[model samples]
Each structure stands twice: as C-alpha cells, then as structure tokens.
Target chain A: NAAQKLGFTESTKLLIIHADDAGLAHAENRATIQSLQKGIVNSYSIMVPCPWFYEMAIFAKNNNQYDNGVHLTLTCEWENYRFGPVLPISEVPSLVDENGYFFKKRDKLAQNAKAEHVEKELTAQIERALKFGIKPTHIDSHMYSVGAKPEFLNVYRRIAKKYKLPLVLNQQLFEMVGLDLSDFKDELLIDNVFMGEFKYFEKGELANFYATALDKMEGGLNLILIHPAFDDDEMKGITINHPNFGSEWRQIDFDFFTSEEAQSKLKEQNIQLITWDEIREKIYKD
Target chain B: MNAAQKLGFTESTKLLIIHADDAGLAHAENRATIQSLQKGIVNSYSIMVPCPWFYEMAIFAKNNNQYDNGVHLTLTCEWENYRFGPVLPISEVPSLVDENGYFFKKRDKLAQNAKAEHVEKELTAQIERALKFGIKPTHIDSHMYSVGAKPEFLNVYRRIAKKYKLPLVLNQQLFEMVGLEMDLSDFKDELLIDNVFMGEFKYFEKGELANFYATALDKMEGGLNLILIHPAFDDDEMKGITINHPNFGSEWRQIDFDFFTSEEAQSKLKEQNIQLITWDEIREKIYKD
Candidate 1:
C-alpha cells in the first residue's frame, strides 16, 4: 500500500490526538466520549468551570482507560453566561473585570490581565482539575489564549513546569500554520510535542495529508489536533455557517476514523496510533 | 409639563438600545441572558432555535414569565465548530440552502439565493418550533444577515408574525444606530409605538448598570426603548465551546449583567419615574386585533 512507502514503522511516528472542550455541554460530551471510546479519538480534555464538569469528571473517573487532560480556561466567550475563576477573582483580580466574569476573548485577557492574576488563575484551574480526579496527561489552553500572549505564556511555562506534563507545541516550518514558539526553548527542551495545521485542508484532505506529513517526521513524541464529530442535526446546528465544520467536512473526519482506508493507510505508512496512556511513562519520565 | 414631559415634546429624546444578535446560543448563553434579564440590564433578547440552548431558554421564559424575548429567525449557523439550520427538514426549504445543506451566512448571499416561499415556510417552521418549546415569543427578529432587508423575506416574516399574532420589532432605530442606509417606510404595516427608548450599552461590568441606566433616563423620551445587554458567567465552558469565536468575551458579559441589575440602577429607574414595561404588554396593545 502507498502508506507503507511513507515509513510508518522505521521512525515510530506516533500520533496522539487529544480532543478539546469535552463536557462543555451534554452534546459535546457525548460526541467526545463516543469518539474516545470508539478508538477514533485517542485523548480528550475537560473544562472544570463548565456546568458539565461534574458529569465529565465522573465519566473520566469511570472510564480511566481514556487519556484525559485539563483544558486550562481563562476567557468566557458566551454572551449571557459565565463561570467564576478557579482561584477567586480576589486572588486573580486581573482575570476578573468590573463584572465578576472572566474576559470573553483571549486578546482582552492578554491585554488586560496582570501576570500575577493569570498565574493565580491558571494554578487554581489546574488544582481544580486535579481535585476532580482528572490526572491530566497534559494541559492546554482552550483557545490557545495562553500561548497567544507573551505574559500568558510566562504563566503557561511556569504551570507546565510545575505540573510536569507535556504542552501542545507545533514546530513545523510551515511558517503559516505553526504557533510562533520562537521565544520558547528548542524542541529538545520541551517534554512533549503537539502537531498543528489540520485546519488548512479541505474535507478528507487532512487524513491524506496526515499520512504524508507523518512520512516526513524525524523524531520525538507528537500530538495531532483534530476536531471530529458526527454529521448530525446537533453538529449541523453548531457548524451550519462554518465551512470548516460543515456536515461533509465532519463526515469526512468521521469516515476517516471509521474507514478501512484510513486504517490501511496508517498500517501501510507505519504510523503508530498511540495514546497518552501508552506514552505517559515516556512523557513523564525525567 | 415637567422636565420629562417638556423634553418629550421638544426634541423627542431618542434612546437607541441595541440588543445582542443571538441569545439561547447554548446553555452558557441561556444562563448568561437569563441573569441579565432578571437583573433588568438587557431589555430585549432573541432566540435561535437551531442552537442547543433554545429549549433551555424556552423553559426559562416559561418559568420566569417575564422579559422581552423574540424569535431570532436564524438562517445560518456561523461558527466553524457549531452549525444549525431550520428545525424543519431540509426537504421543505431547499432555496435557503447552499450546496452544503446549510443556510448561507451572508445576507446578500441568502437574498440572492433563497426563494421567498421557501423562506416563509422555514420561518414558519422556526416559529412553530419556538411555540412547541413553549416560548410565546414577544417579537420576531433576524440573526446576522437581516432577513428583513429584502421585501420578499420581510413579507415572509410579517406573515409569520401576523399568523402567530406577535408584534414584530422592525424599527427605524436599527437603521439609525447602525446607519443601515435603508428606508424603514418601505416595509408594509409599519406599527410604530411611542415611549420607546434605545439603550446603547454593549459590554460594561457589574455596578456599571447604574451609569447605563442614568444615560438612558437622561436621554429617553415619549417612546418604548429596548436596552441591549449580553450577560454571562464567563467560564471554561464558554471558552471551550466558543474557542474560535472572535467576540465571545466571558468577562465583558459578567460586567454587563452586573451593571444591568445593580441596585443603584434599579433605584434610579424608580427615582426617574420611568415606566418599565415588557414586550408582552406592547404586543397585546399593538397586535391584539
């Protein structure tokens, strides 16, 4: 098969995909859990501040086999809704505005939030996640907000170091796709790696591209980011005007996960579909 | 001829209250909007049926039995991660769709592509869905691309509202606030009401509602006015759910709710002798025929 020519076996190209925003709502939780259980998705993260946090934490506790992470949240983007800071706003005052809610956009937080406030909030969120019994395989920002701002990045680095977990970092030279980590340490310094650029492709193209991109992989542990869901009425409602989230688009992702074509491609290309549970030793190993 | 009465007759104090585009977007939105309403910060809100939060908001309206809620006749789901269409099956309204089986996002695109009849059918379906959810909506509005811009679409909206006997919120204030550069009189059966004011506050923090209310009272005159506010708890759920969204600010909404319901503003309304009325009352007067 063409996949075999891509050298999946020789380099040990591992793909650890962690779904974000699990337990955001019953609908999102259902989709994320379905994907994780079906083996279509390898990992997922939870929002501790969300209403569904208790529900998702229980599910994660019951399904301990699944690799989970704590999605560090800061901004609240929904209108007419909000959650309190993991650390009381009194402790993380910069994270709070005149109204007790968190900022809706990351840019606002980055611009307005003080370093101390961000650090306090981030720490509290992590503690909350841990308190809920979600031994997160790693930690990542919900909207890449932490990484987007330098000040927030400082908070991120400190928390990531304290937690002793892998952070999602993309080092690909695609100039346009990867997050600008020029200020961060070299890839060698980071404990774990995350892949990006899946959004650049059309439907089904990402799977093929994933196969090809893996062929070129040189070294180190990696995590692939994917937003996969069923093409149903719920998904349709959420992503109707979204070209990226259209039915056919998500259906392609679903098909790639369900299809033998993807399996065969991975098998032939020698890409090892690894999970956070499998690599926890290597990742956490100092 | 007190100060309020003199002001009303002289210059016609125009209050421009701008409501947020969509509410009941999700559970997060429903929670946020409800608190804002209870606080009396946002005078008006619209519901999008195709969104997950619609049913929750409908139940909220039924329970609270107050607040001015309108049907946000949504034709497009504008987020990359979230999409919704008419509750009616696609077979019923083909003209409102793109090749992807979703409604078009751009108003012009929707106007150019959608058929008037199919639009009416879909709009009616949305209304029926709201009723089924137990939301006796106070008025009808459009999301993103104002469906009311087009004559054909306006007719469909009017027909649906008339059928349901709900007063529609089509006003000159929308054009005046946004400088929409359109003629308001072009639409048929333009039911104009007096004693309306427009609230122009967008996203202010808690305790700021007093300031917003002061601003409205100082400027309001002989007409009903709608103040728009987006209130929310602003948590990880919103962040994760609306990750890619450029505008969904959690903190700003909390401030909005805070200011809308602050005790200072509540006392101020009473001191100013402003008659705070609901859309239901207005609807009864205008559409009870």
Candidate 2:
C-alpha cells in the first residue's frame, strides 16, 4: 500500500539495499563508496558526528548522483573508538558519560538520555550536515535508538516533518526496540525489512540467510540494511570486544552484496532496486 | 634592530603587536576576534583558511580596512570533535593528514610521517586559497607552530612566505618554546620579532592570568615583540570545542579577552610607553616596496 502511494504497483517487489555507517571509518567509507559504485547497494546514510564524516560528506557533495541520508546517532557502541554529540556535552550533559563519549548501549541511553537533549543533538547533527553541504534524502536512526523513548520517537518524526524528508519506520524495529506498535502512517512504515541475524552469522549461513530473504521477499517495499566494512586491522581494533555486528560480520555483508550472484539473484526474483531519493521525490516533493 | 627606525619609531619606544590567533576556528572565535580588534587593543589576527568559518571572517576582513590580518597555516587539528584538513584533496597531500583525512592532532605525528613535499603543497594551497577568496593577507603564521615540526617543513614555510611576499611571524623565543631548534643565521634579513609571549596553563589555572600578562608587559624591552592570545567566550560552543583540554580552553580565552580589552591594560601600555604596531605596517615597510 505504501509502495502504491508512490506510484508503484501493489505486487511489485521494490528493494532498497542500504549501507549503514558510511562515515564510521576510512575502511567503512571506502567499502560504502565501492558498494554503491560497483555493487547493488543503491543508498547509504552517514553519521554526522563521526571522525570520518568530512571524508564522506565531501564524497556526497562531489557525487550528487548517489542517495545519501543522515544516520542520526545517540549511542557509540565501540569499546575503544567513540563519538559523542555534535552539540556540546555540557548542553547535552546527560547524553554523555564521564569521558565525553556517547553511552555504549541503548539501555544506558534509554535510562539517562533526556528528551530535550536528544532533540537538540539530533537537530544539530542534521544541521551540521546541511551546513557542510550534504543534501540528505532521508533520516534514519542508529541502532534505532530513537525508539528507546516515546519522546525521542516523537522528536524523530517531528524533525523529518520539519525538514520535509522521508524516514524509515516499521513495526518490527519498533518492537525490537521494545516500543508498542503505534499506528504510523503508511508512508512512514516500510513493508518488510531484512537484516543478518546473529544466529545465521554464528552458523556461517549469513549469505544463505540473505539469499533466502531475497527469494522469500513479499511484494511491496523491502529494505535490506547492512553494515559493510573491510575486516582490516582498523575495523578489528574498533570492534574488538563486539562480535555480533563486528568487523568479520561487516566483511561478510560487503562480500555477499558485492558478489555477482547477488545481482543475478535480484533479477531472477523480479526485485527492482529503489532509492530513498526516489521516495522523497515521489512521496514528499509531489 | 631596523624595525623601530624603519617604522619611524624611536629605539627607546617599546613596539608591541597584540596578535589574536585562531580567527576562523568557530563562530565564537570569529566573534571574539572581531570584537577584540574593533573594541579592544588587539591590532592583528590570522585566519585558518581550511576551517568552516573562514568565509565569515574573510568577508569581515574584505569589508573592513581598520585591522590587520594574516593566514594561520594550519597543519594540526587538536580538538576531538572539531577538525579540518588541507585545502587540497587528501589524496594529494596524504602524508600531511591522518587516516580520517584531517590534519594530525599533534605536531609529533606530523613530524613522524609528513613528507616535505606534502607539507609544501598543503601550505601553498592554504595561502592560495586565501588569496582566491579575496583576502590580502598581511603576513603568514603557523598553527601550533607546526611548520617547525621538521627542519624541511620550516624550509617550505619560509619559501611560501617569500613566494607570497608576506611577512612571517618569526621569533627565536617562540620557535625555541615550541622546541624548534633551528639556526637563525639564515633568517638575518627577515623581520624577526624580539620576543613572543603566550599565557601558560599553570598561571591560567592559578587565576593569576592578569599578573602573568602584566608582568610580561613590565619586563618588555624595545624592538618588535608580540603577545599571542586566543580570545573567545566560555560559551557552549567554545566549551565544546575545548572539552578535555583546559589549558587554552574557554575560561582561559575569556580571561585573555577580558584582560586585553580592559582600560587598565591599555593604560598600562601608555604608562609603560609601549607603542602598538601591526603586521600591516610591517608588510608595507618590507614587502610593498
């Protein structure tokens, strides 16, 4: 139904293969750039407060053909590597730890993050991106942390509306973040979303899981979110203690999507690749 | 030295240049620089060309003819959150920046890895960028004195200053303070300052900032000298830019502004017979001919 509203048939399988965390590292930035240019990934989002943000921001500014969005972040999950808010820590005092880095877990953020501080920091991130000359197509949450609080969700929706951009909101992600299924508009709710599960990754069936998801995708709008980075020394050091969405997992994501089989499988499944830019133009601009 | 006689001042007259560093660092720094130059005793300031706020301060410099300005050649970005790299693409000057494509956080990293050619290209680009933006810079200086990170890097700095025909912020005392142990016999023809003073963190933390500056003024002798200060408010923006580092953080800058702008400071200069000169005058006397 949401796809039909954007002039797509109800039975059409519209897939948006999005790369997350574009500005996370040089490895991530290089992988994301190549995936979009040489692979099936059509859209990606950037974290404005990351150290490598300017590198990807310059990329987006120079290459206007690609679809870019602001991955609004409030939590930094890395053990040694960290990023805080675009706004001052004093202004958003509760959002940061003693060392002036974002809380590592969403649970820590859910308990301590004030709603006004969230709104201010997220807004600053978006504004900072725009000021740096990035024309973002949509807005998405990092770790879906905005769903940690109902007030944060409200802020997310309000900011998307204020900027007149589309956003990613669905039932499963909300449920995963432990929020009740509020009645969101059809334009906000994507039909289906697929991500690599830890069980499949643990069993070395992550590629099989992606191929199966493509084969079994329902006909509407399907979104596949993946973090793609090289499993190099830099990334391994950043994700040292974390293995679920760690460097090896990201390398798998990059390898699978950038594979020739993945492109052939999309064609055989009658999946048409769409972009957030198209959705923004069709749904909001018109 | 020839500075006093060339500038039409007496040998007994103490010439001081109240220079404000880091003009285009942020909106706070720019606002403070403008106010200090207009309303305070700050006679000269420099613009970090690669920074985001360079355009704002460059416009102010273009429209105003009352103050002196220079290019603050940036080779290091010290803050955790805030950063900027060279004007050229990182691919061109890879050795001058970090893996994130920003300038290194400290000069030691730069000294360890930066090649002389990379430093030459990046610093030349910074000066050309300012000129392209319609800024007639009066002189050239370094951020963190990073050009002195290596002896070869100092060569590039001197060459670029000569290429642009602009005065260099060169002083033996300041170079030695930053651990730049270089021979000054080669710089005899250059208009080198007699001394350069900056507020120390210990004095700032002890709340004896005024006493430090006042004492420095009391010991001031003749010839050209400069006192470098970073004058910004201790607001949210500055506090954020300087989070863990309290040395030249927001409070230190606020005191610098307060002291340098006060009537007491100006009267001290008058009573001490210290005459205020500018980089613009130095450039005119040396380069414009």
Candidate 3:
C-alpha cells in the first residue's frame, strides 16, 4: 500500500538500497563510485563535513546520472581523525567540542548544540555543496538524524523544505528522540523499513546476508543502508580504534555489494530498486 | 676562489641567498613563495616532504626547476595539532617518535634521543621521497636546526649531502656544533655562510618589517650570508597554529612575505650591490664535477 502511494503496485517490492557515507575517505569514495556505477547500489549521499568533500563533489558534479545527496553531517566519530562544520568556528562555536572538532557522538551533539546553531551549520553545508557545484538530489543526515531534540529534528525538515529535496524520514527516529507519531502527522517520506548493517565480515556472509534479507522483503518501500569501502591502509588508518566497521568489514561490503551475485539476486527476488529522485516527485503533495 | 667567485660573481661580493624556508608547509606558504620568487626578493626555498600540501608544491617544483630549492630535512613536528613524522615507517625508526607515535615538538628532545643511524634513514627517505615526486633539490637544510643540535646529527647531514652530491646548509654555530677537528678552512666543498640572519626588527612600527630587511641587506659585505625567511599570510590556520609561539607567528610570517616581495626590497638588493644568489647555483658550484 505504501509502495502504491509512491506510484508502485501494492504487491511490488520497492527497494532503495542506498550506500551512506560517500566522502568519509578516498577509499570509501572509490568503492561508492564503483558500486553506484554498476547499479549494485541505487543511491549515495556525501558527508560534506569531511576532508574528502571536494574529491567526491567532483564525481557528483561530473556524473548527472548518479543520484547524489548531501549526507548532512555534524558528528565526526573517529578519535584520531575528525572534521568540523562547514561554517567557521567563530560562526558556530557551540557546535564544536573541546577540540574545536564536531562532537564525536550523537548524544554529545544533542546536549551541546542549540537548534538555531544546528540550522546555521547544516545550512552552511548545503551552501558549500552549491558552491562546489554538487546540486544534491536530496538531503539526509549521517549517523542518522543529526540530533535527538525535537527542535534539532526541525533543522532536517528546514533543509528538506528549503531545497525541495526528499529527506530520509521515519517514525522510529521521532520515537527514539522522545516524540510521538503525531509529530510527523504532516505527511512524510517514510519508507516501510530501514535495513541497517548486517553482521557479515566476509564475501560469503555478506552475500548470504543480502540474499536472505532481499528474499524476506515485505511488499512496501525499504531503505537498505550500507557503507561500501575499500579495505586498505588509508581506510585502516581512518577506521582505526574502531573495529566494527574496520577495513575488512568494508571490504566485504564492497565485494559482495558489487558482485554479479548481488546484481542477479535483486532480479531473482523481483525487487524494484528506486532512487530519491523518484521518491521526491511524490513527497510534497499538490 | 670561493664558490660564488667561481660562479661569475666577484671574489669579495657579499653573496646573499634570500632563502624562503618551508615551501610545502601549507597553501599559504606556496602562494607567498611563488610571489617572493617572481619578485626576486628571495632566491631560494626548501621543501618539507612529509607535509600534506607537499604534493601540490612538488608538482609545481618539477617543471619550474630554475628556482633554488632544497629538501628541508624535517625531524621535529612543532605545531600543536599539525605534525609530520619521518618518511620511513615508525617500526623501522622507533626512536624518532614519542609514545604517542608523533614526532617530538622541539629540537632538543630529538637531539637528546635520536640515533644518528636512524636520522640518516629518515633524512635519506625524505630526500628520495622528494626526488621520487620529481623535486630536483639543490641542497639540504635542517628544519629548525634539527640536524645541528648534536655532533652526530650534523654528521648525518654531511653523509646525506655527500651521498646525494648536493651541498648542506651551515652557519658558524652549526659548524661549531659539529665539533670537527679539521680547521674551518679545511673544507672548501662545503656551502658555508659566514653569518645566518633570522629575527624580528626589535622595535618597529607597522610598516617597518620591510625596513628591517632592507637595512640588513644594505649592511651586507664580503662573504656569503644566508637570510632565513619564513613567509606566510596572516591566515586563520597560520595564526591558529602559532598562537602561543608569537616569535614566528602569523604577523611575523606575513611581514617576512611582504618585505621579501616588496618593490623597495627588490631594488634595495640591486641598489646595495648585494649579489642575489641561490642554492641551485651553489649546488652546481660545489658538487658539479
């Protein structure tokens, strides 16, 4: 029923298997670019707050067929590695942690940042994308929902409404932030499910996991979020001190996502992969 | 005859190498350095291979080979947040790094702890990395006088200079630090300066940065003198990095860049009849067979 509202059949299994965190590293960018090209991944968004922003912006600008969005980011999670906001420190000092870096955790961000400063900082990120020539197809947050506060969630809506771009939204995000379903009653871009990271460290586990997750899909829209990356020294240095999404984990994410099996598996399941471009058309009702 | 005389300058002419140090440190350094060179205020600069912005400057240096340049051998990383360690892996040169795996922030820490063998490896790696990136260096200068603090460290410098067939930058204090048994006159092949001048103008007004440099250039006579210039814009990053250290702070570097590229400074060098020389000319003069 949800798929049909977005113009798909009621029984049709619509999927938006989007890869998140496009510009976190050169390694991450390389894999995302390849996976998106092969149609293994349907869409991706870039973290404009990171160091590799310019590099990924060039890719998005050159290739119009690829669906790109700004991964509206604030928290830079790594310990040794960190990046601040698009706005200068004096402009958004409260958004920064003691190190003059963006807070590394979601809770710390919510605790420290004022909603107005969050709006300003995220605006600066969108402005940066425009200046750098990446007309983002949509806007979404990195590490999911940049803040938990009710006021903080409004900044996301502000960016989406301002740009007329489809935003990744869910009732669970509001609930997690202590808000009721009535908070999003004004209509939404809600997908039926958000398939988060699967526990697979190798090609077999990865391939098996996606194949299984794809088969048991409900007859509605879904967003399969993954971070595709190359397993290498740059990535090893980047994802250091954190082994969860370490190098080899990302290697599996890349290899299995781009495999012939992944391509053929979607076809076997009769899954229709859609993009934000398609979703945005029906997001704002006439 | 000395190296300057052999290279067409008169025997007693005061040869001044207006060398701008830290060419590859930042975009600020690279932009100011290009202006300084084009204006003929500073005749030379050395590249630090371990920094992030080295790649952009190296590409620029590869084609524009006429300007004087050297591999500024970097061992100590002084900035609070910004740092560059050895070109070699940390495992291979364990003594070069502190417990945090970052290089020490001062020269004395490195001087007390570094092994000459490890210093050679690091120094050699810096050289080959520069050469690998297509930077045809003219000589080698120790960054922060890192190689001059210890006698054995100075030996590493001489060893690398000999191996690369290029000259090494030296002043009398550095020369004395080496504690060489041979008399000062014994080494004719060395590119030694009689004096190295690097400082503020003590007490000066706003526009006096250029006056300080002009007066120094005007006073030069007779031997080869090296003026170490660290030039940069008074940008946020530069200012932020040097907050506690104001001696070589943002305004200090900007002043150096301004005076070195000023029209008055250029004409003053020519007016004072001071010979504007470079390390590239010196390299060939000493090492070219």
Q: What is the lDDT of residue A39 in candidate 1?
A: 45
What lDDT score is found at residue A209 in candidate 3?
70
Candidate scoring better on TM-score of 1 and 3? 3
DockQ, candidate 3, vs. native dimer = 0.03
Which stretches of model 2 miss by more than 4 angstroms?
A: A1-286, B2-8
Please, what are the lDDT tens digits per residue for candidate 3 over residues A26-62?
A: 6788899999887478899989777566568778989
Tens digit of per-residue lDDT, candidate 3, span B129-184: 78887888988898888887677887778878988888778767555644433355
Q: Across the candidates, what are chain A's individual TM-scores?
A: 0.74, 0.97, 0.92
What's the CA error at residue A189 for candidate 3, in Å?
3.9
Candidate 1 positional error at A68, Å = 15
lDDT head-to-head 1 vs 2, winner? 2
Per-residue C-alpha lDDT of model 1 across residues A1-286, encoded as one tens digit per residue: 1112223343456666667767555556766777776645788888776645656776887787888888888876654334546554556777766645577676677677888777877787778677767788777777677754666766786788787776654444222222344555422232234333436454436666655554555444556565555565444544545554344555555455555665666576666666655554554552
Q: Please compute and give the TM-score of the first chain of candidate 2 against the native first chain.
A: 0.97
Candidate 2 lDDT over residue span B64-137, tens digit each: 85788999999999987566777776777888887656788988999998999989988888888788768888
Q: How many residue pairs clash in each candidate at the backbone level?
A: 54, 0, 0
- Candidate 2 at residue A10, lDDT? 92
